[PDB]
Structure formats: C-alpha cells, structure tokens
Amino acid sequence: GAPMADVILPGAAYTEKSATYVNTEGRAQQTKVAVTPPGLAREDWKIIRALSEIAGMTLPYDTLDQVRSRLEEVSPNLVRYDDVEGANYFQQANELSKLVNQQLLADPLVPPQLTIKDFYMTDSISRASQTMAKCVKAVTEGI
Amino acid sequence: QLIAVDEKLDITTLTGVPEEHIKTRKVRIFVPARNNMQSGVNNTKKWKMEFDTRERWENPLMGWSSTADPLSNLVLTFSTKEDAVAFAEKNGWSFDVEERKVPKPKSKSYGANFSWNKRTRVSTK
Amino acid sequence: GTSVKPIFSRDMNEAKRRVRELYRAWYREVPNTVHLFQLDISVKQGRDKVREMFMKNAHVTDPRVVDLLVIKGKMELEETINVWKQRTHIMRFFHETEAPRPTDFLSKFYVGHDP
Amino acid sequence: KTRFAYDGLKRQRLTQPMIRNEKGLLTYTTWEDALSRVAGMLQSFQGNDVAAIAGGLVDAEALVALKDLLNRVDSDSLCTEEVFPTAGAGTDLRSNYLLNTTIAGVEEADVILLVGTNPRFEAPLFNARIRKSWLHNDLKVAL
Amino acid sequence: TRPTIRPRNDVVHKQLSAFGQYVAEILPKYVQQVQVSCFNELEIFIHPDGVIPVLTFLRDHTNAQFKSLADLTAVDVPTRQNRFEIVYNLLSLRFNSRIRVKTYTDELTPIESSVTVYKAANWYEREIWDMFGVFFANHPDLRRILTDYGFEGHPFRKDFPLSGYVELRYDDEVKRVVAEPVELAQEFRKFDLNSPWEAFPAYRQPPE
Amino acid sequence: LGLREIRIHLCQRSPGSQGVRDFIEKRYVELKKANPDLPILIRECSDVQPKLWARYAFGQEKNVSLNNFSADQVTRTLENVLSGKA
Amino acid sequence: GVRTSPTGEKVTHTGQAYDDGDYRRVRFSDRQKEVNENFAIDLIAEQPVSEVGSRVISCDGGGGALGHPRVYINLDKETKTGTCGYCGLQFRQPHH
Amino acid sequence: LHHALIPHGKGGRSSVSGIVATVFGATGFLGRYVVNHLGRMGSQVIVPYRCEPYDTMHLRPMGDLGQIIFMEWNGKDKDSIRKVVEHSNVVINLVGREWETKNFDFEDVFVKIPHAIAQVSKEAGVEKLIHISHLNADIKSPSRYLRSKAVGEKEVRAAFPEATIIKPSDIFGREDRFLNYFASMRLGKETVKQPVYIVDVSKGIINAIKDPDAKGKTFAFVGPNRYLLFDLVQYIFAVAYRPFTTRDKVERVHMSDMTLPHLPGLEDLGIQATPLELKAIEVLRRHRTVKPAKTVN
C-alpha cells in the first residue's frame, strides 16, 4: 500500500502505543507502550487530530483519555476492558436475514490457509520478518 | 484537640514533584504475571505500581540509551489493591488497576492416562 | 469521624492568618534580598514571583497541608535572611536558562512523543 | 506467528513523512508540509469524494478519530478490507458478528460444526481449545 | 549446628524477654507490643503519644537507665496507612544492654520532639525532616541539614526517583550555576534480581 | 439536516432500561423494515443512563435520555427523531 | 583479516563502519579510529582439528583452573566436528 | 533525512537536535554565546580554532560528552576549511577582526575568508550557511571596514545563493566592546545609535537555523529604541557612578546608524528585543567602586 500513495504519514506499531483492540469474542483489551515509534513516527489518533486541527475541523479530544471518552460515547462496550457478556439478539437478526434469497454457487469452500506454508506470512509485520521467511523456506524444502 | 475534618487526603503540593510529572503520568496497579520460562509462583504475591514508558533514544556518543524522565525506573510494592489505590489517589496520580489473575483449579488424574475407552489415553510416556 | 491531630491551626481561619503573616514577611524582605544578593531583577519582579509562588498553592483546602506549607515557607525565608543561599539558589526560581515548553497540541506533536 | 514475528518490527519501517516530488518519486519532508498538503486536499473536496480504508492492524482510537474526521466533511465511505454481509441486521446487532459461545465456553459444547474455516491457521489458540475439549470432554467435530 | 551456623544464646534471650514484660507492665498505656529477635535484640512498639514518657522512663528508671541514644532513624513503607516508622536505639552502659523503641506516623501527623530527653536526638530529628518529611513539634530549630538549599522533595521516600528531578550545571550566558530538568546520557538499568521459589518457609505468609 | 445513523445505548440488567429492551424485542425488526439503509447501532451500557444518539450531516450529534421510558415512549421519541420534527 | 570500508575506514570485527552519509565520522578527523587488528574468528579458523579416538571428549581450554569450565563433547556425528562451547577448538573421531 | 540527525529527547543537554554546526570564529564575543546556545540543546558543534587551545578551554563545559570537536584551521588554506565543514549541515561564519594586522587586513578578513568558506561549504553539500556583517555596511562608506563588509556580503551571496545574511548593529553585552569601550575613557549630539543585546543576536541566529523559510533572506538585528551618542554616554557613565581603535573605530562610531525598514528583524523570528536599560547595570556593575536616557523614535 505504500508505493501507490501520494503522501505517507508514519504511524506506530502495536508495541509502540497504548491502544484498544477487540478480539473475536467481543472482549476489548488495551496494549501498553513498550518502546516509542522510531524516527518521526507518531501515534495514529494524534496524527488524525493534528491533521484535523490543521484543516480547521478541530476534533474535541486532546489526550488519550478524551479519545477513550469519545469511544465510550460511540460505543459503551469499548471502555470495559475484560467484559465479554452481551445481549442475545439472534431472533431479530435471523428474522431480518430471511428477506433476501441469494443463491449459493457451485464452488467448494476452500480456505486461503490450505497448508502450514501459507500460515507464516499473513500481514505486513510477518512479510517483513526474516524468521518467517526462514520458516517458509524450511517448510517448503526440508534438509 | 481533634479537627474532625471530612475531606479526602491530598499531599500533592508537599512532595515537590514537578507539575508535568503529576497530571501527565498514568500509573498501573497490577499483579505481575508469572514468567512463563519458570514454574515458580513466588513473584506473583504482591501488588506492583509502575509508571508508563516514555521515550528512550540512542546516545550520539558511545551508543548508550538515554531517558529524559526520572520516574521510569520507579516501581512500588503494596500488600493489597486498596493500599496501592489509596497511595495513587493520595499522590494525585491517575491510575489503571487490573484485577489479579489466579489460575483456576484443575483436576489431574494419573488413572486417565491408561483409559479403557476415553480419548485421554496416552500414546507413550 | 475522621478526627486528626493538629499542627498549628485548628481550622482554616488560623491557617489563612499564618499564610497572611508569611506573605507580609516575604513582601517586606524582597527588596532587601534584591539589594543584598545583587540581583539583576527589580523589586517588582521579585514581589510578582512571590505572589505567583503563593498563588500556586491556592487550591489547598486542608489546614494541616496549609500550615505545613507555611512551615516550609518560613524555613525558606529564614534560609534567605541569613544569606545561607547564594545568587544561584535565589535565581533558580525564574528558569531564565530553560527553553519555554509549548502548550498547544500541534507544537507538542511536532517536538516529540511527549503528551 | 505471535511469538517469532516481532523481528519484522525492525525492518521496512516508516520513519518520516514522505511526499511526491517533481519527478514523481517519494522524498522526505517535515510533518508541517505533509499535513498542510493533506489538509488542503481534504478542504478542497467534500462528501463522497473523500474515503477511507481501515487495515487489519488498526486500533479503535485511530478508527474513531478517522470516523470523526471524515464525518466533519460529511462522508460515510468508511470501509474495511474484510467484507461482512450487510443484508438484514448487518452490523447493527452486535451478536450478529461475534463468537457468542466464546473460547472459554467452547469447553462446554458437545458438538461443533465448522463451515468453510481452517481454525488451525486462522485462530491457532481457538483450535487448541477445540482440541483440548475434544480430548477431555469427548467433543464431536464436523467440518 | 556445625561451625557454619551462628551459635545461639538463651540466657540473654530470657533476660530480654523478662525485661520486655517488665517494661510493658510498667507502661501499659503506651506500649502496644514487645518482641525479642532470634539474635537477642529487644524491640518495643508503642503509641505515638508515648514518645516523651516511655523514653524518659528508659532514661531515668533505676532498673533501665538507658543513658545513651545510639541512633534515631525512620523507615518508609508506602503500603501502610501510617507511612513512616520512627526507630529509637538506646544503649544502657550500667547494664550493658541495648533496646529499640518503634513508633508510627504519617505525612501530616507530627511527632513530639525528644530533644528534652536526649540532646543527641536534635540533629537526628532534623535529618528525618530532611529525608522523609516527618515534622517534629517543639524542636529548637527544624530545617534542612543535608540537602541543598531550596531542594524540593524528601529524597529518602520510596516514591522519590533515584536520580531526582533536577541536575546542576554551569551556564556562561548567565555566568552562574543553573538547575535543569534531569537528563541522563545512560539510563539506570533496572534489574529484576528477585526470583521465584521462596527460600524461607519459616516466614511464609497465609494465603488470605 | 440529513440523518446519517442512530445509536441506542441500553443497560442489559438495569431496570431503567427495561422498557427500552422490550421495544427491540417487540418491534426493532419492523423498524429495520421501514429503514433498509439507515444504520441503527445497538450497544450495552453499565450503570449508565439509557440514551439515544442521533447523528446528522457534517458530524452534528444530539443525545436524548431513555430512563424509565416505556416501549410506547421510546418508539414515540424514535419516530420523532427520524421524522425530523422537534 | 581487517577489511576497508568503501569510504576508507577499517571495518571492526563486529562489522561496524560508518557509511558515507554519517556525520559521526567527523569525530575521527585529525585523529584515528581504534581497531583491533587480530580477528578472533580468523585466528580460531586456522587451528587444526584434533583427532581423538573416543566417543566423548573432555575440554577445559588448556591450563586446568586457568581455562574455562570443563565440558564434554559427543563425536558420534561423522558429518561434522564437535566444537567446544567456550574455547572454540574442534575435535573429530578417526574416520577411515 | 539521514536518520542520525532525527531530533530526539526533550531538548536538553543530552538530547539530539539534529544540528551539526561549524562555527567559524567561535572563540570571540559572539562565538561563545552561539556555541552555548547550540550546545545546550544537544546539537553537535565543530569549533575551528587558530589560537592556542588554552584560549578555547571555556567552550569545553558548554556541551555534553563528544558534542564539541575542536579542529585546527587557517584562512589561507582551503583544505582545512574543507575538512572542517565536510560533515556539517550548518555553517555559521563569525570571523572578523576590528583592526588591521600585518598578516590579515580588512580585505583578507571580511572578503576572501568568507568567500572561501561559502564556496567550500557549497562544494561540500552544506545546506545552511549563515554570514554576519555590520548593519551600516555600505559599498560607499568612508571606512574600509564597512566597504569590505559590503564586498564580503556580495561575495557570499554570489557563492552561496541560499545564504542567510544577518546584520546586527553594535552588539552590547557582558564582554562587548560597545559598553566597555565607552566606560574605559575615564563628542556627540548629532549621531544616533541602535545597540542590540548579545543574547538577542544569539537567539536570532538559532531561530534562523530552525526557521525553514529564512533561506535567502537578509535580516537586520537592531534594538528597540534609538539613543543619541551624548546622552547614551551620559547614562553609561551614570550607571558606573563615574563623574563626567586607532583610526577606524572613531570614524565608525562617529557614523549614524542606518534605518532599513524593508529588511526583517528580530520580531520576524519571534524575539522581543531587550532594551539597554535592563542589562546596562549587569554589564557595568564591574566598573563601580536610574534616570534612563531619552530616546528618539
């Protein structure tokens, strides 16, 4: 995604910021700052807020706590950091899902992860790792 | 002889800490996780209070690591969660507290390895 | 309940009175200190600095904290009377040599990762 | 992948803002220049002309900040790479796109049906939990 | 007990226990606890209001007469509601013995000064005020004794950073010594030397 | 002036949200029939006042409380919000 | 085996050498860059491989208490030669 | 941007500001302040000196470990200049002598040396060059000092198009000649002076280093108010409590200070000029054993 861009803004990795991620169960957890972003890279929300203030559409939040308060306003669940329980609304979604009647195609369900050789390189961080390349090379051909 | 005043305790103005190191820091109160390389559990008994990580850079001469913040190496030990929370409030530090995690009881049976029909049968020992 | 042992003041009125006496002493002493230590500042600047340092602790609402601060201020004033300090100790109150840290979001975003 | 792909955090890193020069190549600039160009382009256009795509490693703070920024310019073209069927309830009902039974609650199941999934390489810890329940709770698996 | 183990003396232990019981009987209003260590060291935990009486007793009673004040210090334990712990060490030359008196206090509660009882306490008390921030009432002159003039904070507290907050240098523009926010060329490396697998079962604590 | 999305924050176990819950469990699907394109997000609070957030064009948002509202009350204020009348 | 940087400096045994654009090179003008001429890897690569007729061989680095802690090396693998962990000397069974 | 110069730290003594500055003539009155201001923020300083290394000792404690490198040089050889500015990304020129010498005349000091420095800096890839000349420097001035200054200014502009020319006006300070010269005599009413404080000049130079838009601009550093010579000398003697350099200096002081309102000054760099009344006592306290002079605006 980088070479096709016109302006590149360096962000921070997941080990370089206190950030909130929601896993597949709906549980929200926050990371902690282990190191600081290299060079002139800055936090992502900080970059967005600075760009907003430069453009004149200044955003209400200034610090991380204010951004998390905004997150609470948009969604109540995000602030809780170990709660996983939630309401069961299966009936409503199921009843709304019976309207459209799209058909299935005659194509077998083949996942992208067919073999262990496809598991190592999945995202940007993995593709930039020498260890993952070594693992892929070892899996493809063994000695 | 006794004032009998009713107000929360606050010694912020007596510690001499700079103002930028009081309203900007974010302390963490937690039970440190067990080191996965070892089976000992003696390091997960007391509560620890520690400050957030700040910038470290490489020294232009000799390549050492330099830190501009004084509170980076500070760590405090508390017997219980309430004492640590009280300390954090008294010193006027915003805090994040995480409940202690204890491994759940697990039932282990030697007999299960040599099971007649269940799948807990061991292939080798 | 929440009964506590006093230091000098039973309530806030006595603590305010002690603060007033300490301010009177500092205000009276500022020109003598300026002349004796051969400072480059004026008496107006010294009195303004004394006022700023007094108003820095204006949000304290505990008589024990207030009179402990009064004790510390009295100790520092006594330190200043007997010329126990030097010019550097007096002039550390003004930070004439430190660069002015910015306050707005954009400047702090530009300089570094410091929030 | 979690354990050994931290090495990629030390390679191919974005450290400074970059802009396109006269020849069309990427050159380093300051934060002020890149932010000014992006803010000017954002001010010139408005509405559906602006859009955003969220990657697979972005935190909630950046997501909500970008949502607010593009809402201040009257836009709703906020997209993610992975697709989810929006027909019916879509994303309005939270329980429509979550692992409701949860990883901990997997151990209480007696049968499971996997549809078009390879949990070994898509969620290795989820597959480990399924394997543990299969070994201990005599769980029945169908794929 | 082979020659690698420190020998144990029981007569001194019995004598110290008996004297601790005797002292606690004489002054039941102030003493809260009495302890004798395994290496024959007697310590007495008293109420803060009993600093002047108890000490005076230990200095003047015909059976105690602890004439000398060997040391006076404070210990900071942030996990306690009463943060600071004041320790008095007394030496009795007539009976060739030593005793320890322990008291508790916090940041705002003052402790009555014992200059009247022991003159030697004078500087010691100042030192405490310099290092921990404990205020001593009715002191002849209480001020800093060790730190620099104008120093902000009490260094010996557990929440005070090791390197402090400011550092000194010389500036030629103002032609004087100035103080700046502290910046270290090499940061103090923190080592996690403490290990699992507890070593002393005799000090094991209940699992609450 | 153009509505973009609405959000309903309700507390799962609190009684003040009780009637609001009934609303969904009775008629939310029907509402989704009337607005096949309007996004009505539903989220859970915790010891907080039940609320309804409406976002209009260019980022304007207005919030209305829903404590102790019956199903009729909540559906009424909802139709007031979508209909544009105040 | 001391090499030379493309700029002109000598490369340390750890491979460190300032590139063309590094400003820190200015610290060496009117002075010299301290570099050890004897490389440990080259000096140890030229040691002959010892030939012993035992499955397990003991190494203490020579000198007894003046060497490194005594270790035992297994020589069952005929493909390569057992290498001491501390000293770096090599041992090999008498093939053929 | 050659990562080693990415700014780091909180702008302290041990921080990194990403500035590699070569300060020619740093052992003078202005050089010490410029080097101190550069070093107090973590920038690396290269000091080329022609004098005894003993005379340069006062510059050692103004930087952190390894942040100040001293190098021998001379103006007659281009190789020393090339090896001194080889790695620097900023070159500041403060070389200037107020009197003649049998080895260096005004033409050598103010024309040939700055020209060589600018040409070598351009050849070596230096991106920022700062050159300092007098405010009253005119090609038609009666004195050779200002004519040489004027010629030198043109040469630097020709050799280094992106050079920044700074024009201070009779800098005064703790070690300046402007106040000590007048206080050591122990004629006026038609000549006006516009003295400028030394710290203000140093901060202006530093901000010019930081300012990106000040590439080819020319600045005039002047004080807040103008003083007639007579009453300014009266004030100088009154501060010292005292009752009331061969041929070029008297002529130069006898000239009136020029006015250049089109040229940007200290205010364009975000600096409020400090009046002479605040610092006159600090400068002249050492000449001892209140009614400030009237200004014209």
Ligand SMILES: NC(=O)C1=CN([C@@H]2O[C@H](COP(=O)(O)OP(=O)(O)OC[C@H]3O[C@@H](n4cnc5c(N)ncnc54)[C@H](OP(=O)(O)O)[C@@H]3O)[C@@H](O)[C@H]2O)C=CC1
């Ligand atoms: N009144 C003022 O001071 C104001 C200054 N001027 C200009 O500002 C600049 C610096 O001013 P200032 O610091 O006060 O002057 P100084 O005389 O105090 O310093 C001159 C510096 O330049 C060096 N230098 C002088 N001559 C030579 C030479 N022939 N060869 C090599 N190096 C030389 C000196 O080194 P060394 O000591 O070893 O000889 C010294 O380091 C000068 O260019 C001056 O013209 C601008 C307006 C007036």
Ligand SMILES: [Zn+2]
């Ligand atoms: Zn060996």
